[PDB]
Amino acid sequence: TNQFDYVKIGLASPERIRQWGERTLPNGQVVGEVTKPETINYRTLKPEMDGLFCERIFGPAKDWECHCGKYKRVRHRGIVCERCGVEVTESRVRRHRMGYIKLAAPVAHVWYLKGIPSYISILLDMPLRDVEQIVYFNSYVVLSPGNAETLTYKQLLSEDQWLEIEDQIYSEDSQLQGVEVGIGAEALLRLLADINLEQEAESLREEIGSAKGQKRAKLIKRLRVIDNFIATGSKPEWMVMTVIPVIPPDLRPMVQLDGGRFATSDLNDLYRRVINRNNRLARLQEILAPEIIVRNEKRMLQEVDALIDNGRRGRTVVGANNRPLKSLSDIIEGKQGRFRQNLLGKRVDYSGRSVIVVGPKLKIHQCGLPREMAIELFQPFVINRLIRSGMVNNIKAAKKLISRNDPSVWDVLEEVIEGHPVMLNRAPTLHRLGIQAFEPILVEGRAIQLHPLVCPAFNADFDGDQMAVHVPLSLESQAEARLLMLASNNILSPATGRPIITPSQDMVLGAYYLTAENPGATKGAGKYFASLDDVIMAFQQEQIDLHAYVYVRFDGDVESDQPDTEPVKVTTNEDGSRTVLYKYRRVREDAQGNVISQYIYTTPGRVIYNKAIQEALAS
Amino acid sequence: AFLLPDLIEIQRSSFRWFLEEGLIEELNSFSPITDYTGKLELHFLGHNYKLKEPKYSVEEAKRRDSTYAVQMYVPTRLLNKETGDIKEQEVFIGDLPLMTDRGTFIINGAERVIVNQIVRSPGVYYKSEIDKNGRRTYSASLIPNRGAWLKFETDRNDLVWVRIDKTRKLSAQVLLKALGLSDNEIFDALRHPEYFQKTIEKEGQFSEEEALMELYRKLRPGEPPTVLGGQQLLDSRFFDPKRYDLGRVGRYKLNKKLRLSVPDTVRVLTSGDILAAVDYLINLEYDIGSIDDIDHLGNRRVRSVGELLQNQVRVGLNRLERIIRERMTVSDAEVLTPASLVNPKPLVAAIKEFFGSSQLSQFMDQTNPLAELTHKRRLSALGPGGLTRERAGFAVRDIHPSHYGRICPIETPEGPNAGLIGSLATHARVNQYGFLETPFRPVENGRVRFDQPAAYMTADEEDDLRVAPGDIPVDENGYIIGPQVPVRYRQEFSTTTPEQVDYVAVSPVQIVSVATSMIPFLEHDDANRALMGSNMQRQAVPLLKPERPLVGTGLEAQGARDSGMVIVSRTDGDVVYVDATEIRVRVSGQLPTASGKSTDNGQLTSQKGQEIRYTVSKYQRSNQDTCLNQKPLVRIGERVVAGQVLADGSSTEGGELALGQNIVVAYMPWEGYNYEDAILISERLVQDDIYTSIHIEKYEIEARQTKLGPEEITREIPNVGEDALRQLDEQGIIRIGAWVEAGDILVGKVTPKGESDQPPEEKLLRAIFGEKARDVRDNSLRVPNGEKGRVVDVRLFTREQGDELPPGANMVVRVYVAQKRKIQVGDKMAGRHGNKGIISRILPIEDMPYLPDGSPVDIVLNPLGVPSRMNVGQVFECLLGWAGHTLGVRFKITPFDEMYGEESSRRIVHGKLQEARDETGKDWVYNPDDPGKIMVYDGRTGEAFDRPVTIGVAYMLKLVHLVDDKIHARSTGPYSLVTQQPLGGKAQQGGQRFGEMEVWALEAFGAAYTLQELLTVKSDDMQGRNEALNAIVKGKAIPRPGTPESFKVLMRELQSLGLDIAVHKVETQADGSSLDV
Amino acid sequence: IVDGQQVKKGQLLAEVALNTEKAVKDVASDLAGEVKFAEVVPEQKTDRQGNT
Amino acid sequence: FERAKTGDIIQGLPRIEELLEARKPKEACILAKRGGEVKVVYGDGDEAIAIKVIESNGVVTDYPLGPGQNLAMPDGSVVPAGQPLSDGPSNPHEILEVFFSLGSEDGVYACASHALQKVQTFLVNEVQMVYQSQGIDIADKHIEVIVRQMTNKVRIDDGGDTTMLPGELVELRQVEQVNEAMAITGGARAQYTPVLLGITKASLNTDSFISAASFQETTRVLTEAAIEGKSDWLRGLKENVIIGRLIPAGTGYNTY
Which residues of this UniProt protein bind Zn(2+) (chain A)? Predict the structure, then answer.
């Protein structure tokens, strides 16, 4: 909020990642690194020295306590374990500190490498496969001059097809160039930097002038691949790696189940690898023994690519079940891989999730909340109440009546439950009208309660149907629901012009039947009326069919089953009178007077089903 | 009618089968062993095997909640082709449990069961195979029951190559690697092998190719190609048993089709055959042989425990064989004894896998007796061996007229893992080649009567006799009217009359699986309709008081006996006192004895007043917390008869499937309270004392011994009511047979939690409020809220028996409870054919509509439901039942009106009506003008509803999805670790789960706020979330988001992955990099 | 609907019928015995596979 | 026998996505240059199964094939830039050009639209088709809006007449304003071709870094944005959603 603004992103860089990680300290000294594989010792339970879960360079465990010991209480704010690397605070700082494996060899990053695009292969025009042997060195590529004497650059060969090449060394000094042929992966890094992207970028732009076809595509890129870089200017040897980064320990953490089955993690073991492959190696260097155990390990060192992905490009390494040990680059990657689901779709708290059984008794604008989930549902605004008006006092001792189960909750809960908007959602979130809100009801049960009318929107039928009692939290989130998100705030799918909301086909039957007609029941001849409740009466009277059509008064516009403005039975006489049946209604008229009889010719039941309407909507 | 012999024990004898062959069979075959040198030998004896009585049983086994077993044993033969040192003695080999009474293997803990698999039983087949244009191709393929795949093909041009475990070489040295006899192909192929004479590009040189080309000439590269190289290679694909099979069958088949004489008792492979392929494919290339079937039994095939517990035992032992080969030949061998070089432990383990952990067990779901039918015998092709569950794309899923009579279509989980559950023909059986049976009953061109033979095969396939479906108007003694009957040739169903057929039903239902038969008259209900409904009863809940159905199709009674819940004599008797706890031809001392000696027997102790002892079961926690206690059924001194069920368990009275009860059902859209789907029922149900689950479920708890400084349970610690602490017992323990209700207290954990870094208030407050307590803690067990259950047992134990204990842990606390609990709202109750129901509300026994006879009814429905569900007959029963109920009428009659071959059903109904009402006296329960209706005088005040509406008796059956275990709602709590977000694994503190599909529908109106919160502070921000807590109880305007952090978390790993971000203000001096870390 | 015949009520109507690919008629005759070409012969003419 | 590859369980959930990303419906490619008429049955007098196409004004017919799975049969009334000659909305990119080519009397945009709108409007009706096909409904806000979005992106050539680049799949309206800047600051206004893309082509490309790795892309994507400094901004309702900045689309987004 405000403090942040906008996120740039570029190739990271050792020397730049050499700005964080290390944390010099007024021991006067210099702390960053790690070196040696580790979790805590078994017996004690805390990390070690280096140690992948360091209690020093990384920080605390028991909060404000130097590994050196002699450290209790807190208030200190600079402590540096006099004699240890414990610099306490809260045990929170620990989460905000990284280290690095410090690759002895300049390993390169898989994320350029076999990369679908393979940016690295592209630049220095090192064919993926070609450069794919610069690493896993099985063909060291002729590197820079290194061929004045007739051999050629960018050119490759395995040590086996090399020893004989540089064999003339015995005497022939055709070695004036005195530049060794490619040696291994580091070569790529040498050509990565030093090379002049400038004086070459435009050196391609004008090449573009020339024929531009299937080859152009490459060029083209190259331009971008270099221009995209010129944007910064930074190092392509940043794709190659000096030294790693490394995530903090508390988050990959080692886990607790007592008994000895202490799960630990699945990237610290990457490390576990990786650190060892790094140290043991160096620990060759010195003794400088044969490269068969050193240069061969450099591949077992570049093999750190697995750390970054068990899975691109070597066979994956195996897990407890030969699984692609979820790489550090396998945590926020799939829809089920943290990332969105761990942010765009967190699960979250405060709400209900109970079977939505049929319960059409209540109205629509409001839902019916059962008690099984009526307590959680507002405890914060409940505990505060009942104290707040002094009922009790304090927490965990005033909410005494909660778990005490008295009444006074239950009513007070209701007292603070009406006018408290709630929203709800079906197992499927479906559409926006799918998470509608409604005024929760104070009912008791393990099922929901809600208004049929909408189902369909949620479509929540009622056969083992299950949904969820969501709830606003801020106040004005109640607004999201107060007069913006609530069942009343919808009369037609934002989908179409259509008002999906409608009495179920069961009700439409109650409508249809009431508008039908039974041959048998056709009584009430001349049973006309002021068309008021008179016919209702006339129906609370029975002796009439709910479809026995009488002709009932009502000069107001009466939509008639059939055309009613047509000469059907004329009886135009004098002293007024022009008297046509108009089938479903029969005024007599008056030359001097006008129309008044009207005579809507339909069952009282009809007028009945067409009288509770005007009132229903707005009387 | 005819008797249908025991579903269940497919497995059993097949199971049995195994040991009454297998043990040896494999192991003896790799029988002999010896020092690498060869002198000091040792063998598996491969004969006169032995094992002793493992006194552990199943209940005593479940007693230590451990695995049943039989210590497993064998001797060697001897020591050496060095001087014939014997030093024979038995050597224990591999103990482990096995088949249990209720068709389980009571392993540790529990009694899972194994599911059969299909798979492409072996053989060598061959793609017809087609293209981008049309012009087509030919290709061949080979695979045994276990091993590589020999695969072949055609580059447009009567060419070949050979691909195996390589998929990298268009390599074809046919006959140029084995049997390179002078032009042996024009001796085995002879007909158009490569246009009769090879092609250009193919040369067939072998001098250095046989065992030396396509083996190193591109294969397996870099060394030189030693002729031996490929030699010992291609043994090493093949020749070499222990790395390849057919599978005795495999041959059976393989040969049999390609029919070539190779009987030859070899479960590995020859040359010639191969050729016979090779041709054969080209034979089909020249269109002389038909394309293989690759979809159903044609290539697919069951298998099952025997081999499941056989393939791996050879493997598990193969492992051993390596090791021993060292161990035996590790050093001196003079006296080192069979007994010495034998590490059984492997085998036992790995098998301990293969029950215990092979992804294959399930937990044998016993939610319902029936279930454990089905689950005897579904089967799949999920299998190590099986398919993906998403690369096994389609035909895989479909059906196949083989399925007709071989497996039921009404069986389908309709899930992403459905269409993979062989129903197992209601009658099938199988053979040593796994292939199942499905009878084809002969009709001598007009005359069946089942007097003819056969009628018992069509195993996995057919006969190319156009073939008689199940039923058709079968006249008295057979003569099989149908002028011109339709009947099935092969996957097809032409018409023809008594000439040319002869195989026909056993019975009119050879395509079902345990529950798809429940449907009393599926004859009248759509198939698309019949499925999940037929799978409802499949997993029905039980019900305290059982009741046969009403209405009758009756197939099942027996099946109930197959289940085991109901007990038949083992032998015989006429019961003495049949005490509920102890029925007895047990030590009776009486005539349950004597027929318990009817015509007595011997390994059965008739030796003395017979003696058939066995204890009934009370309410025990099923593997699914289901429960059932059977019932002492047969009263005393009342004769029995061998092997006839006399115990009334879960759901039979008497050997029938107690599912539901029988209920009047007027369908009726009344005042709503139901308008799909939506059940309504009358309070009576509760007062009826029926619809009463009961459940009982573990709770347990344990104590650690902290390396932090051990802790126990207590018998209390503070703030204990004895009001708490009372119905407690003498360690802290909780008294059994004691009522509990809600946040109740089990028993007294005592935990460690010192205060070294005394919290800021701490030392003082403690000493300040005025008292010096101590944090010896106690997370003792508090039973969940709403736990109004009397406690009902406990199993429990500590160091002393040797706690068989998860180590690091001190003493078991497991104990638990049930409760009688009547049905409520949202109960997924329904029927057994296209159903799924729940209920609003229940209701005053009076307001609900009643009858002119004067009784009130007890289940509305809606009425529209059924016509829509296109499931009609539910009527039927309604009806039929009606009867039943009016004149106590039983039916138990197979479905499908076949009598006369038309709507006789009808005929039935109105009939049994007719007389019933005729003799019902009132004669109102039926109206001539209401042929199937009734009247409905019973409005709100009991008017006359109007149209005479039909009602009657249905079989309402409830399910589990009880709101109780399916309830859920909570207000925050523990977040995760990693995201540190609370977490919903459907627990008491279960994440209100969450759906971004809604966060993709919650912005359609936007207004952030809810979102803003709606993420934040209930996800990332600590101090947010809390901030909240306060705000409200702090009369404060809950502020403003935190900022998320998980974000930051995601950012962290990224930054390490190689990211950078200046995230920052910019109104700041040249922006910068706001510390958002 | 779609064209119907008249031995009585007709032929398919309703899978709305306001697009025909090539593969074969079967011929397995329909009765066991010697089959010849009494009224016809088999013009080979080899238009699809340049053969027969 | 010719056999059913028709349908009337046809045009369903699958038969629309193939037009959404705008793949190669029918993968046809009939041309246009107006003549147009019955043209015997296949071009010039046809013959035994001979196959060509149609002509009236012109100096020429365009001449590809017609099969028996697949036909034209419109005789005359043939109209290019639309009414496909052999009749096939196929990888309409070709037809979109067919049009705009043939809409090359008008300065590129307006009758480009004339194509453009036509194609989208067509698609709209083509999608709304199955909609009413299938007894339902669909709106322009629900379709046009999206179908619109699906294109606004030209493909350049030549873009160097604007010191830009060729084959550049930027969008039209915007950057050719910049070509309109090179239409008012002199030099040259560049040429290019507005061409449809498809949601995963439009999206995935348009969205970058934060607006990436979360939909139809991930791993290399969003991370590769670092190869180029392409900063990102919480503008995207979801961009800030990944965070908790509130969104735009909420009072304040304008109340500011």
Answer: 66, 68, 81, 84
In this complex, the residue of D4, D8, D69 whose CB is nearest that of residue C16 is D8
- What does each C-alpha distance from B6 to B10, B116, B556 come to in angstroms? 8, 17, 11
Evaluate whether D24 touches C45 at the Cβ level (below 8 Å).
Answer: no
Q: Which residues of C touch D9 (CB under 8 A)?
A: 15
From chain B, the residues in CB contact with D226 under 8 A are: 1058-1060
Chains A and C are touching, with contact defined as 3 or more CB–CB pairs separated by less than 8 Å: no
Secondary element (H or E) of residue B347: helix B345-356
Judging by DSSP bridges, how do beta strands B485-486 and B678-679 pair with one another? unpaired
Inter-chain CB proximity C25 and D1 less than 8 Å: yes
- Partner residue facing A473 (CB), from B756, B824, B1013: B1013
The DSSP code for B236 is I
Contact B992, A352 (CB under 8 A): yes
Task: Give the start-end residues of each E strand in A392-528.
Answer: 422-423, 425-426, 437-438, 467-468
- For D218, other C-beta atoms within 10 Å of its C-beta total 19
Question: What span, in angstroms and rounded, lies between the C-alpha atoms of B333 and D229?
Answer: 72
Quick check: helix, strand or coil at residue B40?
A: strand
**Interface contact flag, A498 D137, Cβ < 8 Å:** yes
Interface test with A, best of D227, D237, D251 (most A CBs within 10 A): D227
Distance CA A57, CA A84 (A): 9
Residue D231: which of A6, A223, A498 has the nearest Cβ?
A: A6
Whether the CB of D221 is below 8 Å from some CB of chain A: the reply is no
Closest CA to B878 of B959, B933, B944, B958: B933
CA torsion sign, A560 to A561 to A565 to A567? negative
DSSP character at residue D205: H
DSSP A483: I
This structure was determined by cryo-EM
- C-alpha B1075/C-alpha B1044 separation (Å) is 14
Nearest chain C residue to D6 by CA distance is C19
Q: Are the C-beta atoms of residues B289 and B126 closer than 8 Å to each other?
A: no
Identity of the residue numbered B893: I
Is residue A460 a contact partner of residue A359, using CB atoms and an 8 Å limit? Answer: no
DSSP secondary structure string for all residues of A330-345: GSSSSTTSSGGGGTTT
Cβ–Cβ under 8 Å, residues B631 and B649? yes
Contacts of A326 in chain D (CB under 8 A): none
Contact B493, B487 (CB under 8 A): yes
CA–CA separation, D245 and A1 (whole Å) = 6
Chains A and D touch (3+ CB pairs under 8 A): yes
Q: Which residues of D touch C16 (CB under 8 A)?
A: 8
Chains that touch C (3 or more CB pairs under 8 A): D
Q: How many CB atoms lie within 10 A of CB A249?
A: 24
DSSP string, B144-188: -SSS---BB---SSS----BSS--------TTSSS---TT-HHHH
Residues of A in contact with D209 (CB under 8 A): 7, 9
Helix and strand tally (H, E) in chain D? 8, 3
Q: Residue A469, Cβ neighbours under 10 Å: how many?
A: 26
Interface contact C22-D2, CB threshold 8 A: yes
Quote the minimal CA–CA distance from D5 to chain C in Å.
5
- Give the 3-state secondary structure of residue B551: coil
Closest CA to B232 of B216, B246, B221: B216
CA-closest candidate to residue B306, choices B630, B84, B11: B11
Residue in B866, B878, B883 with CA at minimum distance from that of residue B953? B878
Would you call B1009 an interface residue with chain D, using a CB distance cutoff of 8 Å? yes
Dist. CA B491–CA B399, nearest whole Å: 11
CA distance A35 to A26: 22
Resolution for this experimental structure (Å): 4.5
